[PDB]
Each structure stands twice: as structure tokens, then as C-alpha cells.
Amino acid sequence: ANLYFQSDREEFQWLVEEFIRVLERGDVEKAREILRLLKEVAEKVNDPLLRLLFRIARRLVEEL
Amino acid sequence: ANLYFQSDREEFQWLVEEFIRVLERGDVEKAREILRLLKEVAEKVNDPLLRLLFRIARRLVEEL
């Protein structure tokens, strides 16, 4: 259970916002750490878009 | 109308896959061109996740 969010998809969106926040601050090490949380939640949602977002996010971390 | 896709969200996923394909081939100019198509479709969907995906994708293009 997670009372903060209606669904795993909503939790995913929250984590995406946090990922963006830390990477836009230049904290690349912390953005990389958030990738793992994104993947864990994406696995719970049967939406391929979430997996593709992870792929783009992971590549962005590599290019920063 | 668009007979290829069930919904704007599905079209968005298709464009995300194309974006990934061209950027992973190293065709950065074409990936940048796909950003505009992603934004146009994201505007039609009331899902903030699609807008956040655009934001990450656009930053990735800048960092390649």
C-alpha cells in the first residue's frame, strides 16, 4: 500500500518530477540513483511508455 | 482521425519509439525534429507524464 498516491502510475510521475528536479540542479549522481526507483515502479505498470521513459532518462544521465 | 492508432496516447508511444530509434542511430538532427511531433501529441493528451517525457527528451537532444 502507498497512501500518498492513487496508483503506481502516479508514483511514477512523482519520481519523474524528482528525477527532473535533481538533474536540472546538476546533481547527476542523485539522478542516477532515482533511475532505479523509476525502473522498479515501471515494472509494476503494464504501460510500455514508462519503460521507454526510463530508457530516455537513463541515456540522459549517461550524457550529462 | 488516425486509423493507425487507437488513441493519441498510442501515437505518442509510437513517436517515442521513433525518437529513440533515430537518436540511438546517432541522428541527432532527426531526433530534434521528432520533438515537435511529440509536443503536438502531448498537448492533446491530458497526461502530465507525456509533457515530462518531452522535457527529458528535449534535454537529451541538447546533451548529445
PDB file of C-alpha atoms in Angstrom:
ATOM      1  CA  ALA A   1       0.000   0.000   0.000  1.00  0.00           C
ATOM      2  CA  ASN A   2       1.012   3.642  -0.512  1.00  0.00           C
ATOM      3  CA  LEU A   3      -1.399   6.287   0.813  1.00  0.00           C
ATOM      4  CA  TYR A   4       0.494   9.133  -0.935  1.00  0.00           C
ATOM      5  CA  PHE A   5      -0.585   8.071  -4.453  1.00  0.00           C
ATOM      6  CA  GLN A   6      -3.687   6.735  -6.161  1.00  0.00           C
ATOM      7  CA  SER A   7      -1.695   4.288  -8.289  1.00  0.00           C
ATOM      8  CA  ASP A   8       1.737   3.081  -9.306  1.00  0.00           C
ATOM      9  CA  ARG A   9       1.479   5.278 -12.393  1.00  0.00           C
ATOM     10  CA  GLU A  10       1.017   8.350 -10.197  1.00  0.00           C
ATOM     11  CA  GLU A  11       4.007   7.363  -8.069  1.00  0.00           C
ATOM     12  CA  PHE A  12       5.995   7.001 -11.294  1.00  0.00           C
ATOM     13  CA  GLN A  13       5.078  10.563 -12.319  1.00  0.00           C
ATOM     14  CA  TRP A  14       6.190  11.812  -8.891  1.00  0.00           C
ATOM     15  CA  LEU A  15       9.555  10.079  -9.313  1.00  0.00           C
ATOM     16  CA  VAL A  16       9.927  11.540 -12.835  1.00  0.00           C
ATOM     17  CA  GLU A  17       9.421  15.012 -11.412  1.00  0.00           C
ATOM     18  CA  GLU A  18      12.054  14.329  -8.735  1.00  0.00           C
ATOM     19  CA  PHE A  19      14.445  12.986 -11.366  1.00  0.00           C
ATOM     20  CA  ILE A  20      13.977  16.149 -13.414  1.00  0.00           C
ATOM     21  CA  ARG A  21      14.419  18.346 -10.344  1.00  0.00           C
ATOM     22  CA  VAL A  22      17.731  16.826  -9.278  1.00  0.00           C
ATOM     23  CA  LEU A  23      19.187  16.580 -12.798  1.00  0.00           C
ATOM     24  CA  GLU A  24      18.256  20.207 -13.548  1.00  0.00           C
ATOM     25  CA  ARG A  25      20.111  21.146 -10.334  1.00  0.00           C
ATOM     26  CA  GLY A  26      23.134  19.348 -11.779  1.00  0.00           C
ATOM     27  CA  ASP A  27      23.084  16.525  -9.200  1.00  0.00           C
ATOM     28  CA  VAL A  28      23.852  13.766 -11.694  1.00  0.00           C
ATOM     29  CA  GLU A  29      24.774  11.223  -9.018  1.00  0.00           C
ATOM     30  CA  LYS A  30      21.345  11.577  -7.423  1.00  0.00           C
ATOM     31  CA  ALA A  31      19.557  11.453 -10.788  1.00  0.00           C
ATOM     32  CA  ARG A  32      21.275   8.123 -11.471  1.00  0.00           C
ATOM     33  CA  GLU A  33      20.027   6.853  -8.106  1.00  0.00           C
ATOM     34  CA  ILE A  34      16.440   7.775  -9.000  1.00  0.00           C
ATOM     35  CA  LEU A  35      16.671   5.655 -12.185  1.00  0.00           C
ATOM     36  CA  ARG A  36      16.484   2.504 -10.060  1.00  0.00           C
ATOM     37  CA  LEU A  37      13.278   3.679  -8.392  1.00  0.00           C
ATOM     38  CA  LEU A  38      11.757   4.529 -11.771  1.00  0.00           C
ATOM     39  CA  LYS A  39      12.540   1.062 -13.123  1.00  0.00           C
ATOM     40  CA  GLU A  40      11.059  -0.642 -10.056  1.00  0.00           C
ATOM     41  CA  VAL A  41       7.766   1.213 -10.447  1.00  0.00           C
ATOM     42  CA  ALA A  42       7.656   0.870 -14.233  1.00  0.00           C
ATOM     43  CA  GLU A  43       7.858  -2.912 -13.791  1.00  0.00           C
ATOM     44  CA  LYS A  44       4.588  -2.777 -11.829  1.00  0.00           C
ATOM     45  CA  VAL A  45       2.706  -0.865 -14.558  1.00  0.00           C
ATOM     46  CA  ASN A  46       1.800  -2.626 -17.798  1.00  0.00           C
ATOM     47  CA  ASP A  47       2.495   0.509 -19.848  1.00  0.00           C
ATOM     48  CA  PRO A  48       5.410   0.363 -22.328  1.00  0.00           C
ATOM     49  CA  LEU A  49       5.617   4.165 -22.273  1.00  0.00           C
ATOM     50  CA  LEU A  50       7.022   4.054 -18.735  1.00  0.00           C
ATOM     51  CA  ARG A  51       9.773   1.669 -19.854  1.00  0.00           C
ATOM     52  CA  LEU A  52      10.597   3.937 -22.789  1.00  0.00           C
ATOM     53  CA  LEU A  53      10.744   6.939 -20.438  1.00  0.00           C
ATOM     54  CA  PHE A  54      13.261   5.032 -18.311  1.00  0.00           C
ATOM     55  CA  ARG A  55      15.331   4.332 -21.426  1.00  0.00           C
ATOM     56  CA  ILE A  56      15.494   8.030 -22.351  1.00  0.00           C
ATOM     57  CA  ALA A  57      16.145   9.066 -18.749  1.00  0.00           C
ATOM     58  CA  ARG A  58      18.955   6.538 -18.390  1.00  0.00           C
ATOM     59  CA  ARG A  59      20.614   7.765 -21.594  1.00  0.00           C
ATOM     60  CA  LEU A  60      20.315  11.363 -20.410  1.00  0.00           C
ATOM     61  CA  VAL A  61      22.188  10.502 -17.212  1.00  0.00           C
ATOM     62  CA  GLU A  62      24.966   8.971 -19.342  1.00  0.00           C
ATOM     63  CA  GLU A  63      25.233  12.101 -21.494  1.00  0.00           C
ATOM     64  CA  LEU A  64      25.333  14.660 -18.650  1.00  0.00           C
TER      65      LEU A  64
ATOM     66  CA  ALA B   1      -8.927  10.672 -37.391  1.00  0.00           C
ATOM     67  CA  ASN B   2      -5.932   8.311 -37.469  1.00  0.00           C
ATOM     68  CA  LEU B   3      -6.654   4.664 -38.333  1.00  0.00           C
ATOM     69  CA  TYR B   4      -3.102   3.559 -37.388  1.00  0.00           C
ATOM     70  CA  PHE B   5      -3.623   4.109 -33.634  1.00  0.00           C
ATOM     71  CA  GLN B   6      -6.353   3.581 -31.066  1.00  0.00           C
ATOM     72  CA  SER B   7      -5.633   6.895 -29.338  1.00  0.00           C
ATOM     73  CA  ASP B   8      -3.378   9.920 -29.160  1.00  0.00           C
ATOM     74  CA  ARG B   9      -1.519   8.235 -26.309  1.00  0.00           C
ATOM     75  CA  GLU B  10      -0.708   5.273 -28.556  1.00  0.00           C
ATOM     76  CA  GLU B  11       0.503   7.603 -31.304  1.00  0.00           C
ATOM     77  CA  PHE B  12       2.693   9.301 -28.696  1.00  0.00           C
ATOM     78  CA  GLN B  13       4.273   5.951 -27.768  1.00  0.00           C
ATOM     79  CA  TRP B  14       4.950   5.274 -31.461  1.00  0.00           C
ATOM     80  CA  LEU B  15       6.698   8.641 -31.793  1.00  0.00           C
ATOM     81  CA  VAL B  16       8.744   7.953 -28.627  1.00  0.00           C
ATOM     82  CA  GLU B  17       9.951   4.704 -30.153  1.00  0.00           C
ATOM     83  CA  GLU B  18      10.912   6.536 -33.361  1.00  0.00           C
ATOM     84  CA  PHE B  19      12.703   9.217 -31.346  1.00  0.00           C
ATOM     85  CA  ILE B  20      14.674   6.534 -29.520  1.00  0.00           C
ATOM     86  CA  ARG B  21      15.463   4.730 -32.772  1.00  0.00           C
ATOM     87  CA  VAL B  22      16.899   7.768 -34.538  1.00  0.00           C
ATOM     88  CA  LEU B  23      18.819   9.092 -31.516  1.00  0.00           C
ATOM     89  CA  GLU B  24      20.353   5.658 -30.856  1.00  0.00           C
ATOM     90  CA  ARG B  25      21.489   5.675 -34.511  1.00  0.00           C
ATOM     91  CA  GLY B  26      23.202   8.987 -33.764  1.00  0.00           C
ATOM     92  CA  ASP B  27      20.880  11.052 -35.993  1.00  0.00           C
ATOM     93  CA  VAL B  28      20.565  13.955 -33.566  1.00  0.00           C
ATOM     94  CA  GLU B  29      19.135  16.336 -36.167  1.00  0.00           C
ATOM     95  CA  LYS B  30      16.245  13.963 -36.830  1.00  0.00           C
ATOM     96  CA  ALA B  31      15.663  13.330 -33.115  1.00  0.00           C
ATOM     97  CA  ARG B  32      15.288  17.088 -32.630  1.00  0.00           C
ATOM     98  CA  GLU B  33      12.709  17.136 -35.431  1.00  0.00           C
ATOM     99  CA  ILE B  34      10.672  14.416 -33.708  1.00  0.00           C
ATOM    100  CA  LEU B  35      10.483  16.549 -30.528  1.00  0.00           C
ATOM    101  CA  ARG B  36       7.987  18.843 -32.258  1.00  0.00           C
ATOM    102  CA  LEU B  37       5.718  15.918 -33.118  1.00  0.00           C
ATOM    103  CA  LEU B  38       5.903  14.641 -29.542  1.00  0.00           C
ATOM    104  CA  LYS B  39       4.897  18.036 -28.157  1.00  0.00           C
ATOM    105  CA  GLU B  40       1.968  18.331 -30.574  1.00  0.00           C
ATOM    106  CA  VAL B  41       0.559  14.973 -29.489  1.00  0.00           C
ATOM    107  CA  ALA B  42       1.272  15.509 -25.792  1.00  0.00           C
ATOM    108  CA  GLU B  43      -0.838  18.681 -25.953  1.00  0.00           C
ATOM    109  CA  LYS B  44      -3.825  16.546 -26.991  1.00  0.00           C
ATOM    110  CA  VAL B  45      -3.488  14.140 -24.035  1.00  0.00           C
ATOM    111  CA  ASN B  46      -4.345  15.338 -20.534  1.00  0.00           C
ATOM    112  CA  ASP B  47      -1.482  13.340 -19.009  1.00  0.00           C
ATOM    113  CA  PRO B  48       1.358  15.325 -17.378  1.00  0.00           C
ATOM    114  CA  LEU B  49       3.667  12.328 -17.805  1.00  0.00           C
ATOM    115  CA  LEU B  50       3.771  12.920 -21.565  1.00  0.00           C
ATOM    116  CA  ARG B  51       4.853  16.531 -21.011  1.00  0.00           C
ATOM    117  CA  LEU B  52       7.555  15.390 -18.596  1.00  0.00           C
ATOM    118  CA  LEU B  53       8.760  12.820 -21.147  1.00  0.00           C
ATOM    119  CA  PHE B  54       9.078  15.633 -23.692  1.00  0.00           C
ATOM    120  CA  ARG B  55      11.112  17.644 -21.182  1.00  0.00           C
ATOM    121  CA  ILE B  56      13.585  14.789 -20.646  1.00  0.00           C
ATOM    122  CA  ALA B  57      13.736  14.009 -24.367  1.00  0.00           C
ATOM    123  CA  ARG B  58      14.395  17.646 -25.237  1.00  0.00           C
ATOM    124  CA  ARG B  59      17.227  17.855 -22.696  1.00  0.00           C
ATOM    125  CA  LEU B  60      18.729  14.642 -24.057  1.00  0.00           C
ATOM    126  CA  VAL B  61      18.860  16.143 -27.551  1.00  0.00           C
ATOM    127  CA  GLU B  62      20.714  19.154 -26.105  1.00  0.00           C
ATOM    128  CA  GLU B  63      23.267  16.926 -24.368  1.00  0.00           C
ATOM    129  CA  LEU B  64      24.054  14.650 -27.343  1.00  0.00           C
TER     130      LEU B  64
END
